[PDB]
A and B are shown apart, each in its own frame.
With several copies, the nearest count.
Chain A
């Protein structure tokens, strides 16, 4: 099937709320071994975001049920059987996405905006493994997550002004990573405030086109800082 067809069928899958089909359509484009443009890049992200997001949501619910069946042996057993299956889907999805990233996207990516996007997504999909993982296995996955965020971060610091949605969205997810995974609430609060301070400083130079996503993230930065100070 044509790139044009698969990209249009991804939007049909989006509108139909069939995110599994949408991800399959965008994967079929990605296996062409060509770069994705700004539109195509964002479609691939929006697809796999909701596909993994459903499994993340279902995992959190079932994990909470396993604690709410504390001492009900057979029911907690059934909850663990249910959990580790949803983890397997989440894990397989992350393994598939990191495969798509490292096989096709990350070598062929030209622009710094595209590189930092894919290196954030590498960081994120290693972080969703660090969410579910246990044992020593989590340590190397956390190092991979931190490495990909740091590699993105040092490029974004040079090739992208503060007010860019991807520089803010990287800073957001990386400060969240410091809280959720690294047990580094001071470093989280350092990074999140620094991105907030830096984004305000040049806010008049930001376009009407790029405005909306950045100020969504600047709301979220402040609300995360309000949480991490209340804790």
Chain B
């Protein structure tokens, strides 16, 4: 799934 940090 899409990445967040």
- Taking Cβ atoms with an 8 Å cutoff, the residues of A that contact B are 124, 169, 172-173, 176, 179-180, 213, 216-217, 219-220, 223-224, 227-228
- Interface class of chain B by DSSP: loop
Question: What is the size category of the interface that chain B forms with chain A?
Answer: under 10
Q: Are A173 and B2 in contact (CB under 8 A)?
A: no
Contacts of B4 in A (CB 8 A): 124, 172-173, 176, 220
- Interface class of chain A by DSSP: helix
Q: Are A179 and B5 in contact (CB under 8 A)?
A: no
- Assembled-state Cα–Cα distance A222/B3 (Å): 10
- Assembled-state Cα–Cα distance A219/B4 (Å): 11
Q: Are B3 and A224 in contact (CB under 8 A)?
A: yes
Give the shortest distance, in Å, between A195 (CB) and chain B (any CB): 13
Give the shortest distance, in Å, between A169 (CB) and chain B (any CB): 5
Q: Can you name the residue of chain A whose Cβ is closest to the Cβ of B5?
A: A169
Other A-B pairs beyond A172-B4, A217-B5, A223-B3, 19, CB < 8 Å? A124-B4, A169-B5, A173-B4, A173-B5, A176-B2, A176-B3, A176-B4, A179-B2, A180-B2, A213-B5, A217-B3, A220-B2, A220-B3, A220-B4, A223-B2, A224-B2, A224-B3, A227-B2, A228-B2
